[PDB]
Design an enzyme around this catalytic site. Sequence first.
Site, PDB file in Angstrom:
ATOM      1  N   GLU A 171       6.461 -11.707   1.061  1.00 56.22           N
ATOM      2  CA  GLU A 171       6.842 -11.032   2.275  1.00 56.22           C
ATOM      3  C   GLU A 171       8.322 -10.978   2.521  1.00 56.22           C
ATOM      4  OE1 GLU A 171       4.998  -9.406   4.172  1.00 56.22           O
ATOM      5  OE2 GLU A 171       3.033 -10.215   3.722  1.00 56.22           O
ATOM      6  N   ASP A 182       7.484  -2.204   8.051  1.00 55.63           N
ATOM      7  CA  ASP A 182       6.899  -2.697   6.851  1.00 55.63           C
ATOM      8  C   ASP A 182       6.586  -1.551   5.885  1.00 55.63           C
ATOM      9  OD1 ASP A 182       4.587  -1.465   7.810  1.00 55.63           O
ATOM     10  OD2 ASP A 182       3.511  -3.367   7.974  1.00 55.63           O
ATOM     11  N   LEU A 236       3.820  -8.981  11.808  1.00 54.34           N
ATOM     12  CA  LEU A 236       3.623  -7.667  12.382  1.00 54.34           C
ATOM     13  C   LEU A 236       3.839  -7.644  13.871  1.00 54.34           C
ATOM     14  CD1 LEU A 236       2.753  -4.800  12.585  1.00 54.34           C
ATOM     15  CD2 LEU A 236       0.549  -5.613  13.104  1.00 54.34           C
ATOM     16  N   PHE A 253      -3.639 -12.710   5.234  1.00 51.07           N
ATOM     17  CA  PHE A 253      -2.398 -12.626   6.016  1.00 51.07           C
ATOM     18  C   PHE A 253      -1.879 -11.203   5.930  1.00 51.07           C
ATOM     19  CE2 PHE A 253       2.155 -12.930   6.324  1.00 51.07           C
ATOM     20  CZ  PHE A 253       2.423 -14.024   7.157  1.00 51.07           C
ATOM     21  N   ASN A 289     -12.644  -5.175 -10.079  1.00 49.54           N
ATOM     22  CA  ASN A 289     -13.066  -4.582  -8.825  1.00 49.54           C
ATOM     23  C   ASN A 289     -11.960  -4.651  -7.793  1.00 49.54           C
ATOM     24  OD1 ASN A 289     -14.671  -5.093  -5.895  1.00 49.54           O
ATOM     25  ND2 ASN A 289     -15.668  -3.754  -7.351  1.00 49.54           N
TER      26      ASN A 289
END
EC number: 3.2.1.17
Length: 162
Positions: free
Chosen positions: A11, A20, A32, A104, A132
Site C-alpha cells: 500500500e 487510490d 480509504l 484489507f 482461479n
Amino acid sequence: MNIFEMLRIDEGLRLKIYKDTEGYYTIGIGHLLTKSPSLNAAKSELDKAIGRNTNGVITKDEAEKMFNQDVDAAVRGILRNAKLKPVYDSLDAVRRAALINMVFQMGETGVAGFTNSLRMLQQKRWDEAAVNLAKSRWYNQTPNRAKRVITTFRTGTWDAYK
Ligand SMILES: [Cl-]
Ligand SMILES: [Cl-]
C-alpha cells in the site's frame, strides 16, 4: 516479515490525501476515506477519523495508528464472517496473512465473493486456487499486487515479498 510489513509494501505510505487506483480518496497506509468525489467530504471524514482539524495532512504516527486499527478491523471482519472464518482457520500463518491482505484491500464482502477460490484454499489445492484467483477483475486491475498475494497462497512462503 509479517502482515504489517506486507501491507506496508503493497500500500505504501502517503501523508497527504490522494486518490487510490480506483480514484478514491485515501490517505496513510491504504486508508480509504470515502468513495465520494468530494474532496471536502474526504477532508471531513479524515478529521473525524483523526480527531482534529487536519487540513488534509497527517503525521506518520497518525498514519500508523490508523493502520493498526484497520488491520485489526480486517482480522476481526474475517473472524466474524461465516464464509471466511473457516477458511482462515484452516490456513497456516503465512497464508492467513495473504487472506488478510485481500480483505484489507477489498472488504470482507468482496472477498467472501470468491467462493470457488475459498473452497480450494480450504482444500489445500494451491495451484488450483492460484489459477482461479487470477480469473478476476482484481487480478486484471492490480496485477502486480495480485501476483504477490497469489504466490503467497500458492507457496506458503514470503518469497514474493523478498
Ligand atoms: Cl476510522
Ligand atoms: Cl498492482
